[PDB]
Amino acid sequence: NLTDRLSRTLRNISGRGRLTEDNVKDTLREVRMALLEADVALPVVREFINRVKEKAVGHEVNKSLTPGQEFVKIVRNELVAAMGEENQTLNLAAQPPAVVLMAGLQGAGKTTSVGKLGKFLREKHKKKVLVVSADVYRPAAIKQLETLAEQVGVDFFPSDVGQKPVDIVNAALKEAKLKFYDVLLVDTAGRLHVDEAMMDEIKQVHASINPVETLFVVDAMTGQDAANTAKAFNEALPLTGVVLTKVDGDARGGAALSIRHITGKPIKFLGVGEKTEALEPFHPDRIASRILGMXXXXXXXXXXXXXXXXXXXXXXXXXXXXXXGFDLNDFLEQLRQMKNMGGXXXXXXXXXXXXXXXXXXXXXXDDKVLVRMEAIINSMTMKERAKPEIIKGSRKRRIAAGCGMQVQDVNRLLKQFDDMQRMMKKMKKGGXXXXXXXXXXXXXXXXXXX
Amino acid sequence: AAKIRRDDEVIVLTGKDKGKRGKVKNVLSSGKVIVEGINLVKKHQKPVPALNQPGGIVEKEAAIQVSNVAIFNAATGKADRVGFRFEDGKKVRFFKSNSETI
């Protein structure tokens, strides 16, 4: 949670006019102690913050002379170029065959990441995927891959602990070339970088498969040893890329920076939940912005994921509002669809303009509130949903009693639907550019918060 | 020359809280003080979405006239009245009964 420390830091800087180099210094020190609190590659903390120090001395901006915009912009863009220079769109280069391996320390997230890639590339590539587990060591690891593969709808190549990993992956590659697959995901056992028999074993594995891609998997909570791990794995194995996992934790995962300092290999993907859908393309703009608290890249990516899962359902709510007008039917459809894409952190990060006025500790529980709405509007007869104005006291007693909640809550939800009804009408009558530009941010006077 | 100050432990002479003791949060200009656990009122708050303020009945602490609170002597366990003397060159407060400094 750098944003607590980095917020006091870079926000402190963004206050003071024509800042002395001393609070510049102190702020750098707090970024250092902040990344030190994040257990990111402590020597690489020192290096990074020395770089930020040298960069932050002589900048001038006519737009706004504020040095805090300079520290925020510098820390951002510098973490950006050090983390691979805005590589989101690029990802991995696809050839008609592709063979990718997942390697790294015990428990970093390799098996999970393999299935995430499977799902993601299954969606984007429109092609066929085969996966295989080279892990004969961890109990039930193969079964884990089989389960994940069955869940993501990806062909699974069987293997058991009684075999040799080389023979297994050789068989897998053979079957794959025979059955005309393209993307191949090979999940390997977790291993210490200082374990020679294992590292040799998978040097042999790589030698047998001849992969186009070797991906090192990093827990974002990985410590100072990262630079030592990445190098080791890059010296024997050598890796062509990096995946950074568990970024949904408060760990800042700048260890990958060390990993990208030694290796020089791009970081392709951000693991952002425990679910298969949780593979994101990595992007330094997104991780650095995510740290800083306000983001333009993650705003366009969460509005484009919301718009992708909600396209046919907002066109279903727009067709029913074209025929019967806006009802609790079109609203309820909006509710279930809205509950399926639901998350709060990907929503507040999309809007920096509203988060500048309100506390960043603001959270509505979407899983709670949304499903509550679905439930309450599941307690209405179809006439009350298509004709909401007839909902009365006894009706709200009935609705409140049906879902096992309070009448006040139902009042609140019908209030919400009232506001969204109005908004639907205002959107209907006015031109899109006028209705979007005429929205007012009200202060009861320019004096703030009152 | 101000007798009752921040963080003094006081005892309440008058009102529904008569006899109760507590700690001073702050003072106001009008000669009113606000004391810990003292003079709770039940206030109704219209829920405010900007401050993420829920609604409901908030028990709050309402200002009490400073004439009504006495500085609590911990030695004697009694309410006291206060006075001023000069010790060192500095102006200091003391209890009238045992004439000991604070």
Partner: peptide, 18 residues
Amino acid sequence: MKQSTLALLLLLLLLTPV
């Protein structure tokens, strides 16, 4: 598409602070 962004953006959003 547009109407998606329009609707759901200030739907989710406008629901949170208002």
